[PDB]
Design a protein around this ligand. Sequence first.
Ligand SMILES: Cn1nccc1C(=O)N1Cc2ccc(Cl)cc2[C@H](C(=O)Nc2cncc3ccccc23)C1
Ligand SMILES: Cn1nccc1C(=O)N1Cc2ccc(Cl)cc2[C@H](C(=O)Nc2cncc3ccccc23)C1
Ligand SMILES: [Cl-]
Lengths: 302, 299
Amino acid sequence: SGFRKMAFPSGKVEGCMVQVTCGTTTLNGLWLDDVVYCPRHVICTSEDMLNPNYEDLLIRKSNHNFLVQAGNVQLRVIGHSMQNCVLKLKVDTANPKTPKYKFVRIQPGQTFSVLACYNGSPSGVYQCAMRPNFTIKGSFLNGSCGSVGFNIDYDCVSFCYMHHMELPTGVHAGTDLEGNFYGPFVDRQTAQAAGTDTTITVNVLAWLYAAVINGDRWFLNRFTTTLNDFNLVAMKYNYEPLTQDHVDILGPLSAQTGIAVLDMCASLKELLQNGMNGRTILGSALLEDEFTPFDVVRQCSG
Amino acid sequence: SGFRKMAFPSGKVEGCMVQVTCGTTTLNGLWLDDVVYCPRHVICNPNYEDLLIRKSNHNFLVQAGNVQLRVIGHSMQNCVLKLKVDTANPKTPKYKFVRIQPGQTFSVLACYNGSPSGVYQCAMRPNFTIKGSFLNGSCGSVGFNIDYDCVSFCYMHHMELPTGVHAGTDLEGNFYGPFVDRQTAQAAGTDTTITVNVLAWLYAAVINGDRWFLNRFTTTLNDFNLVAMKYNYEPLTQDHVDILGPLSAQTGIAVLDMCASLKELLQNGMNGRTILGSALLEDEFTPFDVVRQCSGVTF
Ligand SMILES: Cn1nccc1C(=O)N1Cc2ccc(Cl)cc2[C@H](C(=O)Nc2cncc3ccccc23)C1
Ligand SMILES: Cn1nccc1C(=O)N1Cc2ccc(Cl)cc2[C@H](C(=O)Nc2cncc3ccccc23)C1
Ligand SMILES: [Cl-]
């Protein structure tokens, strides 16, 4: 019993964190085999961030301009290339602690663990979700650039995010490990803002099924709804539209609890109308949306 | 910017998790140097000296990854079983066994079959239980803090109470709370809110630009403790006030000034508003957790 926001054990990722320095900039790198991946804005000198020409800045660099530090050991850079917004530094030593890994690009609503680092040293681990507006509500301070988001599947680490920047509302933007940004963001300190955020409906439903699995049923009702009527209601509360794929994905949880997906949708509709009336669901006074259907199955059953 | 419930990096602890099997029971063990520590109920009113005397070293199957460790001795210290093994753990970090006080937080590495599956942050409740997330097989999972490079082991999971909350011991086998390691009628006492932690979380909200709850008022410590007693909040001591000093100096809001904000929040509620994305007053962040997360301390 119990339901917590749980992160993956960070050990396999900790053994990959390095510190990357170029001139006066210091950020984090991910050392996998003989390559160190880091944000390409490590080559920028702040008054470059408005309109940086990364190809022009990178052509003026040599291998010995990049100082890479893994613990108390300096790694020697023997090559460098840019792939989208990530800089790949070829090093002379392969990481002996390299786990089994993959680079995966995730979709909004997906969750992942973040190992927050400063100066190549991990300081904390937390769980979070890719928001529908492509930002993450992280906990990052200056120097956290290059911190990574991941999931662990059996013994394989799936790298899905690299931290690049903080937007004006306090939210964060970054790229997949191939350097492609999530969202319409760019590695420039130009006027950019996160779009209006919405609630991840399929995740709230998954969390309502987890509450039922843990013995809480107060919010259920005798009603059902059509998918269309549910979306008509939910959009008025800034909830993401629920698709037939979301309904299909919730099938296992529906079969385990005996509550049809559209019956649970009627309960959610009523919760949005009434609020919680002093009650909580899994120790929360708000409807939680940072647990996917997959997270619920993994934590409530295994 | 941002404020998350953050756990310590679990790597130094992952390298210590082993699977312990005795008969039909399988749980987790903590392998430090040449000793494996695990709940003594793995051998299961039970007379544990009588049950343990009937066991031999080869009855305990210890598995570290895909390698079987050979047990060469065994002894009991309170509610923890100590299994002497032939191989010292090469991944043993610098460590200490520490006993924590209620209100103090720690990271939990939840494990099943000697394999770590998740890490989460939680607090020792005033009623000595933890609101964890555990299933059958979690027994022997450990709670810890990391101080520089030293891991401080403070908790070992033993059981789940009827309300869904958890009970365990320190690494010396002494239970937190009036609990016993057996199948009997026991229940968690009435819980209370950790006041010093709520205040720390209100200071973290101010640091992140959330000031709506602030007011021009102050209060005496005595007048505030009468309010705390009425709302099932733990009494706030002069030590708690002293501990909050750095946060008070950083934000410019005196501790008793923040107590007046909490008093108004307790008597009037949040009125549709949230603080750090929460509609409830959060109490599982200590004053030190707030300073550490709002400064970027590494391990
Ligand atoms: C935040 N900001 N708003 C205007 C100017 C800045 C600013 O400090 N930076 C500008 C900037 C622009 C584009 C890119 Cl790709 C990176 C950056 C850097 C950045 O965003 N770094 C940070 C990354 N993550 C959490 C941070 C928290 C607190 C400070 C900094 C953080 C530097
Ligand atoms: C919970 N319960 N109510 C009646 C009987 C049991 C019961 O399963 N156990 C009895 C018991 C008695 C004393 C001690 Cl020290 C440990 C235990 C064990 C325990 O509590 N283990 C668990 C520990 N943590 C989360 C669990 C989740 C689901 C199952 C088990 C869990 C087993
Ligand atoms: Cl995805």
